[PDB]
């Protein structure tokens, strides 16, 4: 646990989160929930 | 807001082929286009083509009649 520093978190997040496919499971009143494509775009920041 | 009861399954755009569907079941696509629209195409082409040919026939007869 102590070996997980700020640079380690960023490396792992880039391996697993950055521009990665996601799975979505929703139930109930979910018409206002954004579509898969919106959620997929929000996996990366184009300003960097 | 409309009350709705439904289950929707969707697949990621990066897990499917994008363009090969353009040339799939092409015979069915052509058959559907022809069979559903041949009356519509007839109603648009026939008055235009028929009127055009009649005018050319009229001009040809008028031109020949004025000759000596």
From Swiss-Prot, chain A:
Catalytic subunit of the essential mitochondrial processing protease (MPP), which cleaves the mitochondrial sequence off newly imported precursors proteins. Preferentially, cleaves after an arginine at position P2. Component of the ubiquinol-cytochrome c oxidoreductase, a multisubunit transmembrane complex that is part of the mitochondrial electron transport chain which drives oxidative phosphorylation. Belongs to the peptidase M16 family. This is Probable mitochondrial-processing peptidase subunit beta, mitochondrial. Heterodimer of an alpha subunit and a beta subunit subunits, forming the mitochondrial processing protease (MPP) in which the alpha subunit is involved in substrate recognition and binding and the beta subunit is the catalytic subunit. Component of the ubiquinol-cytochrome c oxidoreductase (cytochrome b-c1 complex, complex III, CIII), a multisubunit enzyme composed of 10 subunits. It comes from Arabidopsis thaliana (Mouse-ear cress). It is found in: Mitochondrion; Mitochondrion inner membrane.
Curated annotation (Swiss-Prot), chain B:
One of its GO terms (biological process) is mitochondrial electron transport, ubiquinol to cytochrome c. It is found in: Mitochondrion inner membrane. The chain crosses the membrane at residues 38-54. Its main location: mitochondrion. One of its GO terms (cellular component) is cytosol. Keywords: Electron transport, Membrane, Mitochondrion, Mitochondrion inner membrane, Respiratory chain, Transmembrane, Transmembrane helix, Transport, Ubiquinone. InterPro entries: Cyt_b-c1_8-plants, Cyt_bc1_su8_sf. Residues 55-68 are mitochondrial intermembrane. It comes from the Eukaryota. Residues 1-37 are mitochondrial matrix. It is a single-pass membrane protein. Component of the ubiquinol-cytochrome c oxidoreductase (cytochrome b-c1 complex, complex III, CIII), a multisubunit enzyme composed of 10 subunits. The complex is composed of 3 respiratory subunits cytochrome b (MT-CYB), cytochrome c1 (CYC1-1 or CYC1-2) and Rieske protein (UCR1-1 or UCR1-2), 2 core protein subunits MPPalpha1 (or MPPalpha2) and MPPB, and 5 low-molecular weight protein subunits QCR7-1 (or QCR7-2), UCRQ-1 (or UCRQ-2), QCR9, UCRY and probably QCR6-1 (or QCR6-2). Belongs to the UQCRQ/QCR8 family. Component of the ubiquinol-cytochrome c oxidoreductase, a multisubunit transmembrane complex that is part of the mitochondrial electron transport chain which drives oxidative phosphorylation. This is Cytochrome b-c1 complex subunit 8-1, mitochondrial. It comes from Arabidopsis thaliana (Mouse-ear cress). The lineage of its organism: Eukaryota, Viridiplantae, Streptophyta, Embryophyta, Tracheophyta.
